[model samples]
Target: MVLSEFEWQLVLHVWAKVEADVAGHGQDILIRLFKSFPETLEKFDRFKHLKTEAEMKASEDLKKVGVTALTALGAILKKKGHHEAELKPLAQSHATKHKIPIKYLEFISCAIIEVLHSRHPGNFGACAQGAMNKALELFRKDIAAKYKELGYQG
Candidate 1:
């Protein structure tokens, strides 16, 4: 959870760009997620059967949730300790309510990397890639552990 100064700065830079067009960039990330892992669709009521990028793009609810999700994630990137306010509830909801395995959370990091690489292209080089990967992996682990501690046997 502790980001080096370089990592922190890179994350802030990337998130600032993402925040500029939250809904557009958020849908971009979610599209990557759904395309890369079709199984994720089952966990989403609005996204079910939304196999194509065009289909997802057309859904009002999908955009709303996508924007909201990314907005929360951006808040966490902007400041430390926001994860307790943002990610904790997400972890509990996805784990207990949706019964999503923690592994999926880790897998979503791959989609995020793809989105970042695509958006930033040459700017998202090895250093930034490694930073984002490490940060998200730690973030995912923390949320998963918190999910277990929330009294969900599943």
Candidate 2:
């Protein structure tokens, strides 16, 4: 959670790249998630009907969800793990309504880190990656605990 000034800048820079192409970055990650784990699609009635990646890409809800997710990520980056009060709603919704398991969220963190590295080859070095990874792991742990509090067996 604690990052050096340079590490913080690196994290912010990678997020800026994602922010620059929110739609593309978001959709790409979601598409990969759904494709990589078809079972995850069953959690969302809104997206399950989409038969292909293109259809998922074209979905308004999909885009909105992607945008919202990125926005939350931005928030996490900004507050540096001090935004838990603001983040609880999202965790609760995913756990109670969406019934998303913690592992899927972990997968999302992995995907985001991987995509950021791939998208900006030189920009994301070990320091940035380590910071992001640790930060996201902290995020994941908090949400998973919140999810449990919400009485989600998953």
Candidate 3:
């Protein structure tokens, strides 16, 4: 997907400030993500229950898997022939499990990335665009993995 200038700028911030290769593996991506998108919790609830209890929360796992998947996505995208077709079944599972419409899933994902990109200008110039794509793929992979683990093959 082609990003707008503003969107591109936002993605750059995430890549430069939050990713493993640029900043550090343990970069404050979570804080940045939450701070920029304060309504993210509510947004998540549009799909899942997003429970308030620590063990029941979706954000915690989302953040971890988000980061891990983004990391993998970045590396894979850099290599040729890494189409994301293998990941859709995962997304379908999330859509089914959370009863989240596909549109909402796309909306939340884009919102998170847009916020990630918009937060910093001093860093995250143009290079971060790649990371955004990577993150998207990671999210897809995450849902698919969970679906598979939960015996969601259908």
Candidate 4:
């Protein structure tokens, strides 16, 4: 995704804080993701059986992917020409292979909002949140178009 100047500033600022403690913050977002959107587990192969927060907390797969998310976020922010570097292939694979729904991709935004605000009540401002949302909206738009281009009926 290609973030604008304002989005770059806001998201990079927040991500700096979030990235500092990827071990905790990343898992926090994922726990909230599965809990907030229960069907999210159904979308994944390994995570499908994880039902309780405690169970998910102890799961190795959850931990790895959660941290990987932080890595991807870091790369997305720092990389130039990010669309070709990341979003395009991610869109293609997640579309054709994972068969992930377009809307489901945006579901993580809700959990991100919950976790960030919970982590720092006043810092995750409307502007920052909107900036992050817009960046994800960019990802959603690119991936949604790919879904059509790839002829995914869903």
Best by TM-score: 1
Which pairs in model 4 have colliding backbones? none
Least lDDT summed over 10 consecutive residues: which range in candidate 2? Answer: 1-10
User: Candidates' TM-scores?
Assistant: 0.87, 0.85, 0.39, 0.85
RMSD of each: 2.0, 2.1, 8.3, 2.4
Per-residue C-alpha lDDT of model 3 across residues 1-154, encoded as one tens digit per residue: 3345554444444544545442222223433333444454454444245333332333555556456645644453333224345445445545465454444444545654554555554564455645565556455455545555555542
- Largest lDDT belongs to which candidate? 2
| Alpha carbon lDDT at 47, candidate 2 | 76
Ranking by lDDT: 2, 1, 4, 3
Clashes of each: 0, 0, 5, 0
Instruction: Please give me the total number of clashing residue pairs in predicted model 3.
Output: 5
Q: What is the C-alpha lDDT of each candidate?
A: 0.76, 0.79, 0.47, 0.75
Error of 4 at 17 (Å): 1.2
The alpha-carbon lDDT assigned to residue 112 of candidate 1 equals: 75
Candidate 1 lDDT score at position 30: 80
lDDT tens digits, residue span 36-105, model 1: 8777777787567677899889887888877877776677766643467777777778777878787777
Candidate 2 stretches greater than 4 Å from native: 1-6
Candidate 4 segments whose C-alpha is farther than 4 A from its true place: 1-4, 79-82
